[PDB]
Ligand binder design. Structure first.
Ligand code: NAG
Lengths: 170, 106, 52, 170, 170
């Protein structure tokens, strides 16, 4: 998309992540572990459902019947009615196609956005203690055990403690 | 040693269309164009008159088929193809105008 | 009488919250606008990027 | 927003900043200061008044009366006229609603954009002599007085003349 | 634009570049050399041509004649027809102008986007072996020749080989 995260520097997504939309998956001394991030998952779903609720809602304009099916109306006013109705149906078909298209473009470029926002939150969490791998992975220098990763998730990770070690491991 | 960021995906994608690409595959999409029809006239909370063989204009003149509707009263007036506005042949002048009048007549 | 609707046509009743329909251009009542397209799919999710 | 700066990693806004839209706030030995930035505020308001200038102007098409208010026209042609006019009214309501919606969305995402552009300019000026706070601030290892900050806000800051002092302060 | 790469921190473009859209321009010991990057070019190109494909095509819906040029129609129905056609013509003019304006905005911001995606790609190839210029250049620290550059532009660049030198030369 526009932010180059989805179908971008993150090569592909994880078909096993069912907890939510976006999450972390760490490899450390204590084994692999994958778990979602509620914050951004909800940040995207709330926006998509905003689109829906704004779109699927009815107008209160009621239309009456102006021509007849069983007893056809006069020819000139019938050709005018049909002409008008075809022009209107053309307008609405165009409005609908353009609408769906642009809401889909903005939806994809929105999820891409929320991903890049998460990665760029982890990045500012791990200030100098970790290096950008490039495939959306962060290479941690110090020893981050299965409880330290949780501090990375909860945004409770204090980098000052581990900065001494990871800095030197340059 | 490391921590990775990423998103989800499914093996059964649903294809949509965008400004910039035709048939881009996404996770879950919905429908905006209704085709689910109900093959009945749904009239909950409406006084309905199924004219049947009685034509709508025949409720004024009163041919035999329309005896049962001489003083009808409705919120929803249902016409049928088998309606016959006349018994002795003839036709109303500006008949569609008077039809449009009687349709919103109650 | 049991079913409840506010948009009719020669073929029945259009019960729907969607903003469009491809059923009958002449339909009357409080009706979604008629469009030519059979289906217009609105995305409610991100791009599907699976393992190759 | 899409870029994650406004109501993103920046907690909230500075209600007192009547000098402009965006700005710098510095905290050093000589105190605390708040100043604005004409470049980004202007490159934004130009764009917004660009939108206004594109929308706030009327069409030169003139219409005529085609029915009558005191002596109602024939029933059939009046019902056709009404059905057509109400259809037009529905179309224009829809186009208006979607116009305001999609122009507001792009307005806010535009403001987010300008903020993130500033916060990346200040970094590329402030090469490794400073590190990213996380709340949208820049922690500088060397000493910046008021003239130092006023040299950052003018894009005049040179990183070499403060390279050593701060780098050793890793 | 929205991404501040084109007409942003990258001062301007290169009229000399006729190979593709975006590219690299290096100045090392073995003289200056510049050549274009194909993946980004073909991305932006395939997207813009996607817009054209969606636009350049015509409806199959056919409209008949409802008036007469040689023998003017009855006056009232003619004024209703001209009123309807003027209203529709007005609608399509608005839809056209809005469509083109938004497709241009999005196009520009999309090329801006692809530029930012290339810059941020290389920035992650050269993990700690270079430093951010501020004008879209990458100040390398190790002695990269006209073959190590071609290993950048193929992404075959290994940063671990040349890490020691560039690190020490900090
Ligand atoms: C058409 O609408 C106007 C107001 O919108 C109303 O005054 C008039 O009676 C309507 N015409 C018919 C034939 O119902």
């Amino acid at each position: 998309g526009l932010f180059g995260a989805i179908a971008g520097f993150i090569e592909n997504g994880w078909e096993g992540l069912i907890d939510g939309w976006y999450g972390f998956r760490h490899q450390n001394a204590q084994g692999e572990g994958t778990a979602a991030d509620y914050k951004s998952t909800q940040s995207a779903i709330d926006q998509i459902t905003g689109k829906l609720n704004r779109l699927i809602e009815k107008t209160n304009q009621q239309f009456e019947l102006i021509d007849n099916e069983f007893n056809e109306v006069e020819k000139q006013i019938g050709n005018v009615i049909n002409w008008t109705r075809d022009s209107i149906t053309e307008v609405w078909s165009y409005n609908a196609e353009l609408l769906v298209a642009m809401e889909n473009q903005h939806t994809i470029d929105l999820a891409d956005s929320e991903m890049d926002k998460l990665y760029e939150r982890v990045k500012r969490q791990l200030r100098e203690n970790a290096e950008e791998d490039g495939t959306g992975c962060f290479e941690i220098f110090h020893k981050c055990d299965d409880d330290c990763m949780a501090s990375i998730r909860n945004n409770t990770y204090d980098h000052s403690k581990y900065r001494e070690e990871a800095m030197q491991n340059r | 040693d490391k921590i990775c960021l990423g998103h989800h995906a499914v093996s059964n994608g649903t294809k949509v269309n965008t400004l910039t690409e035709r048939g881009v595959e996404v996770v879950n999409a919905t429908e905006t164009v209704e085709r689910t029809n109900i093959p009945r006239i749904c009239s909950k909370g409406k006084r309905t008159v199924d004219l049947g063989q009685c034509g709508l204009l025949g409720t004024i003149t009163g041919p035999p088929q329309c005896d049962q509707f001489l003083e009808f009263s409705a919120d929803l007036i249902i016409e049928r193809r088998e309606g016959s506005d006349v018994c002795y042949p003839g036709k109303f002048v500006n008949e569609e105008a008077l039809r449009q009048i009687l349709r919103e007549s109650g | 009488a049991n079913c409840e609707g506010d948009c009719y046509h020669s073929g029945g009743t259009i019960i729907s919250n969607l903003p469009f329909q491809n059923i009958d251009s002449r339909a009357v009542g409080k009706c979604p606008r008629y469009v030519k397209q059979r289906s217009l799919l609105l995305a409610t999710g991100m791009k599907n990027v699976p393992e190759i």
